[PDB]
Amino acid sequence: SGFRKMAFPSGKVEGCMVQVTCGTTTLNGLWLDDVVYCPRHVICTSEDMLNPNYEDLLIRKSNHNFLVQAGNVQLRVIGHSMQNCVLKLKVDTANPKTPKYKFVRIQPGQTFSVLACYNGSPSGVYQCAMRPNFTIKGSFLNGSAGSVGFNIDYDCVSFCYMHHMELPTGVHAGTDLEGNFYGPFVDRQTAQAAGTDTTITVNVLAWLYAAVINGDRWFLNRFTTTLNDFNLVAMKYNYEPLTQDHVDILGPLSAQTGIAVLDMCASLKELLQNGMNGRTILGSALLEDEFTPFDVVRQCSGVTF
């Protein structure tokens, strides 16, 4: 019993973290085989960050401008290239701690663990969701760019996020490991704003299922709703529409609990319209949306790696 925001074990990722310095600008890199991947704005000075032309800026650099330290050993850079918003620095030594890995691009509403790093060293790990507006609500200070988000499946690390920047509302934006930004954001210190966010409905439902699995049932009721009626309520409360694909994804949870998805939707509709009347669900006074259905299965099933 119990249900917590649970991150993946980080050890496989810790052994891939290095530090990348270019001038007086330092951040983190990910060392896989003989390549270090890192945000391209490591090549920027402070005056460069308003309207950089990264092609020009990179042309002006050479291998010897990149100081890459794996703990105490300096890795010599023998090649550099830019892929969208990441740099790929070729080093002369393959990481002997490279795990089985994949680069994936995740969808909004999916979760991942972040190993937050400074100067190539881990500070801590925590679980994030990709918001519908393509930001993440992380915990990142200056120097944390190049920290990565990831999922584990069996023995394969799936890297899905590399941290680049913070938007003015305090939320965070980044790329996949091919350097494509999630969302309509750019790595330049210009006036940018996250679009209006929404709540991840399928995840709230998953978490309501987690609550039931852990013995919290006070919010259940005898009613059902149709998918269309539920989505008229969802739209009113700034929740994402629930699709039939989402209903199917909740299948393991509806199976385990015996509560049909559209029956849980009637509970959620009542919670939205009426509130919680001073009660809590899984220790929370708010409806939690950063657990996916798989996240619930993983935790409540004991999936390991």
Binding site: F140, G143, A145, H164, M165, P168
Partner: peptide
């Protein structure tokens, strides 16, 4: 406020 590169 502008974006901040970290």
């Amino acid at each position: 406020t502008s974006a901040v590169l970290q």
